[PDB]
């Protein structure tokens, strides 16, 4: 996260850290005790799926304070329409091997209904994005979880202001074009969360952009509203052998 602030411990309790062989991979969002939403592109280069771990309750990577809960990832589910190496359909649904325990520091974010998300949440201007990603373009990553408030643009306005991959109906733009504030590498998979009448909802996933905080460009986020029905159906289904599952989309 570029130009944000430290998220006070416990104020981003749905944030997930994904690790492979102990190294930081990506972010994610807890939406129930065994389900995490992340970005499909985070998994393009995984060789052995047994080395993938999700951490909930994390805040400061330099210390163990006892609020952290680690789980093996049992399934990574990606839409059939996602093509490795590209940007469209950048979403993954992860099933944890065992549930996390909800606590003051571990709480799921609400996955909204599609209509509510499209008719109401889509018009809330500002939303929060978070992660342990790079604090600058070409810079070191964060030791403490960072958070940033970003405004959402209609895609017509994003294209008119941006001065390359297309912005599809499965994406939206958010942030600032003046080079000051953006999500970055290492934040991929993390939540774009929107507050509405006292409750926070998942509206986006950190996906891609041109460098980070590049003048004339905005961050691009997966438009989660397009995937609600897809996600809900998968969460109602029985697990299948083999970590990686490609599931038909729509």
């Amino acid at each position: 996260i570029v130009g944000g602030k430290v998220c006070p411990k416990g104020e981003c309790p749905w944030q997930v850290l994904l690790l492979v062989n102990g190294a930081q991979l990506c972010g994610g969002t807890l939406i129930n005790t065994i389900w995490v939403v992340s970005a499909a592109h985070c998994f393009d280069k995984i060789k052995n799926w047994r080395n993938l771990i999700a951490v909930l309750g994390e805040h400061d990577l330099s210390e163990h304070d006892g609020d952290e809960q680690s789980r093996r990832v049992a399934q990574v589910i990606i839409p059939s329409t996602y093509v490795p190496g590209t940007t469209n359909h950048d979403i993954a649904l992860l099933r944890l091997h065992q549930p996390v325990v909800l606590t003051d520091h571990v709480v799921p974010l609400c996955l909204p209904e599609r209509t509510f998300s499209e008719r109401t949440l889509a018009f809330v201007r500002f939303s929060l994005v978070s992660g342990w990603g790079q604090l600058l373009d070409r810079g070191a990553t964060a030791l403490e979880l960072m958070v940033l408030n970003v405004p959402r643009l209609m895609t017509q306005d994003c294209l008119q202001q941006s001065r390359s991959p297309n912005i599809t109906e499965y994406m939206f733009c958010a942030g600032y074009s003046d080079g000051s504030k953006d999500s970055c590498k290492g934040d991929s998979g993390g939540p774009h969360a929107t507050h509405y009448r006292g409750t926070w909802y998942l509206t986006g996933i950190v996906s891609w952009g041109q460098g980070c905080a590049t003048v004339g460009h905005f961050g691009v986020y997966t438009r989660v509203s397009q995937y609600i029905e897809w996600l809900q159906k998968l969460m109602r289904s029985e697990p299948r052998p083999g970590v990686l599952l490609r599931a038909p989309f729509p």
Partner: protein, 56 residues
């Protein structure tokens, strides 16, 4: 009331029904109050709320 305007007045989810009828609904872990629009938690850790801020 219609769900595309002002979310039908609902705190969370809104369904349009045949006639001038509207029904609000809530996410799992919440129940709808008798006002027909407000949602209140029914569990210790409902989704989308931040415990340390709800305690203050």
């Amino acid at each position: 009331l219609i769900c595309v305007n002002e979310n039908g007045g609902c705190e969370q989810y809104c369904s349009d029904h045949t006639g001038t009828k509207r029904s609000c609904r809530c996410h799992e872990g919440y129940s709808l109050l008798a006002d027909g629009v407000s949602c209140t938690p029914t569990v210790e850790y409902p989704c989308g709320k931040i415990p340390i801020l709800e305690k203050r």
